[PDB]
Design a protein around this ligand. Structure first.
Ligand SMILES: Cc1cc2nc3c(=O)[nH]c(=O)nc-3n(C[C@H](O)[C@H](O)[C@H](O)COP(=O)(O)OP(=O)(O)OC[C@H]3O[C@@H](n4cnc5c(N)ncnc54)[C@H](O)[C@@H]3O)c2cc1C
Ligand SMILES: Cc1cc2nc3c(=O)[nH]c(=O)nc-3n(C[C@H](O)[C@H](O)[C@H](O)COP(=O)(O)OP(=O)(O)OC[C@H]3O[C@@H](n4cnc5c(N)ncnc54)[C@H](O)[C@@H]3O)c2cc1C
Ligand SMILES: O=c1ccn([C@H]2C[C@H](O)[C@@H](COP(=O)(O)O)O2)c(=O)[nH]1
Ligand SMILES: O=c1ccn([C@H]2C[C@H](O)[C@@H](COP(=O)(O)O)O2)c(=O)[nH]1
Ligand SMILES: O=c1ccn([C@H]2C[C@H](O)[C@@H](COP(=O)(O)O)O2)c(=O)[nH]1
Ligand SMILES: [Cl-]
Lengths: 213, 217, 218, 214
């Protein structure tokens, strides 16, 4: 099981593992009441009637590289398991999300988009050089890192079941979410679709509350 | 699929699993940006109480157990369950009848075989009543209320290895009811087979119960 | 005190509550300090737009007496805390739910409803008798009890936040749920409404998925 | 009840449901006294690891903390969080600047007072860049990504006493970052005030950390 989607300038969402498939929900559901067409139909039935427990039996592990401001929003999803790169224990790499100029179109900035991008690059560089200077000076990493900006990239593993993934997408795959987290949500959705096509289609048709998928 | 028989009619069966010991290693290694190195990290993790990397190992079991066992089991909230429904299915004539040997250590007034026999009789009376009620048109969801707590039920249980260790701490232990201890022994056997390093680590550094140190696999 | 009788020997009792509607408003705004129309409008906005995290800051503790078959459905609600009456910290008692004849009227049975009641009562009586006999003979109660029917009453404390309570109502205050647990959920709703009227009205207006609370006062 | 933490931080108690006797009532399952026997039950529960009764005591705190502290805190999943968002209320911009004493015990190339200064300098320049972006029409959600991890945020945290004890095990400990230990000590103090018997039995039998005994 492997898929990797690149996101933003340096980010990604990578599928590490998966347990089960659409039929894992069918099998869990069928236990209640003690054929391809009827199995597809049952998935559509569960989704329509809001019986989402059978989808908890499908599980994913992702490996994600995202800016801290993205990761912070993401880790609000409590029904999941995380392990994240540590700024207390690791020397942090010079990797920051610098938005492209096209990210500001629609907005009428009094300076050109290219200069916004550059100003972001500049402050980031200054902050990172300060962080290094502090570390080289003997300041512990856990203190030195507090000067680094929220666009610093972090990495995490994320284990999450299909039900929680549907909740995650209802919130994040939506135009009211910040564009950057939308991009990550589209990548999660794309992988979900690949691995669980019937669940994903049913989700879209019956349960999905957002407007971008 | 690994299937272990438990009690007179029960079982624990492994349906699926995601990951293995290395899945915990991979997840732990992310913090800080070889076999005996990897196995050493598992022990270190367990020794210092960082159980989060073990959440990335996930099992699905299919379990057949008496309702009284299932009700205890289902108290474990950090897990997913789907169970056979007495509202929606006619229920099978299957009930846990304790063996005579279940009743020793206990000074009783009637022989253990008599205890066994009186349990059987009540089971048989209740099931016959249940069948009569269904035949008379009583909806299943009402008719089943007369059935005893030793009725067998069936469920799928999806659970990560951290939560499985919690479960073992509470149920693979002499304070737990003997019947659920038996199920927790089978759960432990399957955990050990799929996750040997995590399992040996758990036993050596974090397991809080008594029997898994006493009783092989 | 609020205690509502349910079924023949059941009940829902309110033990404690943290917060009120304004606990959700304060949490949404992250402000520890009142403007009724504004605060009520925010409750509705949150509910309409599916931002239910603020409602997690209101919490209830109930004491419920219910038959085991109801409890097994109820305890499937994992986002909550339960303590069930065990025989380790308090005395156990033995009572059972015997459906009334009217529970079956509207079902074509080949025996009168009263005979159903009698047959249920009869088996309950024999099972209880077997149980007592086993106990009196030295059989430990964890084994003796396995003969007892699923209509045996149990009791539990349930601590649950308003968001999770609303999820419980969606599934249980609904004609697809078993009638018995419907009756419990109507009592839960009555209490929730009493304590959190604005949240409860907004819930029914924008988020509630069931049928019965829109038909049945309280 | 409010306790100030760091230079501009705080923890304040917003609400509480229950007290020590709420655990006692849950354990016995009885809505309907004896100090001695009730305390004994609390100790008995704690020493045998039966922590479910403590889930029936619940707290709401209001916390002001730097983002790097909040990221660690929000990893506690068995709890409810609401974080300050500009959608429902006014944002302000303050930053945690460490005191020179925070470096004591570290032999550093530059004086601790100069470390402090270098931190204030970046905060200042990052904040100034943020305001320049905002004034030029960059949306806030983009402009803010240049702000440092010491930026203060605020949140409401609703947590039951069991999950609160878990939190204290991990954060009221010398292996946890100093800054979050400080907040964990405040949480502990409020917990002790409201549930003395529970808090006492926790320290005696179940608490895994070091600092609350010191
Ligand atoms: C009419 C009816 C018929 C039913 N028939 C059956 C049956 O045949 N068999 C059967 O087993 N059960 C059956 N159920 C029970 C049902 O499947 C659920 O177990 C129960 O209603 C709890 O739902 P919940 O998870 O939303 O509640 P909680 O378990 O309190 O969950 C509430 C919220 O938490 C989230 N959540 C909690 N844990 C997880 C998790 N691990 N993964 C993802 N999200 C999570 C969800 O977003 C949800 O909105 C039936 C229920 C009803 C109402
Ligand atoms: C000194 C220290 C160093 C740390 N270093 C790192 C690091 O390098 N990287 C990193 O990512 N994190 C790190 N952490 C964070 C830590 O690993 C946990 O994320 C955090 O402490 C939450 O733990 P918890 O799951 O018990 O709390 P909650 O998340 O509130 O969970 C509480 C309880 O519920 C159970 N539980 C809850 N959810 C689940 C679940 N999904 N599966 C199984 N059981 C569950 C647990 O058994 C636990 O007893 C560190 C923490 C400390 C204190
Ligand atoms: O002491 C620690 C170290 C890391 N974490 C968590 C918090 C974040 O999700 C990551 C990284 O935190 P950091 O403070 O950068 O090491 O892991 C923690 O909760 N406590
Ligand atoms: O050993 C025990 C005893 C009770 N419980 C739980 C399960 C039920 O919800 C109640 C009552 O269980 P009982 O087996 O009736 O004592 O408490 C348990 O999980 N383990
Ligand atoms: O309406 C229902 C039907 C089943 N369940 C759950 C409760 C048990 O775990 C199983 C079987 O319950 P039963 O009441 O036998 O259908 O599924 C439920 O919660 N609600
Ligand atoms: Cl609706």
């Amino acid at each position: 099981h492997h898929m990797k989607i690149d996101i933003l300038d340096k980010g990604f969402v990578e599928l590490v593992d998966v347990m089960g498939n659409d039929l894992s929900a069918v099998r869990a559901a069928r236990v209640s009441f003690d054929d391809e067409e009827r199995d597809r139909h049952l998935i559509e039935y569960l989704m329509k009637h809001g019986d989402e427990t059978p989808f908890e039996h499908i599980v994913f592990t992702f490996h994600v590289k995202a800016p801290i401001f993205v990761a912070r929003q993401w880790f609000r999803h409590r029904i999941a398991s995380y392990n994240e790169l540590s700024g207390r224990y690791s020397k942090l790499s010079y990797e920051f999300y610098i938005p492209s100029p096209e990210r500001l179109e629609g907005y009428k900035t009094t300076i050109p988009p290219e200069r916004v991008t550059e100003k972001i690059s500049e402050i980031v560089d200054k902050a990172y050089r300060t962080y290094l200077e502090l570390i080289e000076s003997g300041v512990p990493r856990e203190v030195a890192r507090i000067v680094l900006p929220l666009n610093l990239y972090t990495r995490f593993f994320w284990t999450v079941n299909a039900r929680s993934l549907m909740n995650f997408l209802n919130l994040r795959a939506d135009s009211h979410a910040q564009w950057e987290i939308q991009q990550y949500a589209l990548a999660i959705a794309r992988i979900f679709k690949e691995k669980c096509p019937w669940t994903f289609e049913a989700f879209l048709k019956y349960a999905y509350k957002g407007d971008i998928l």
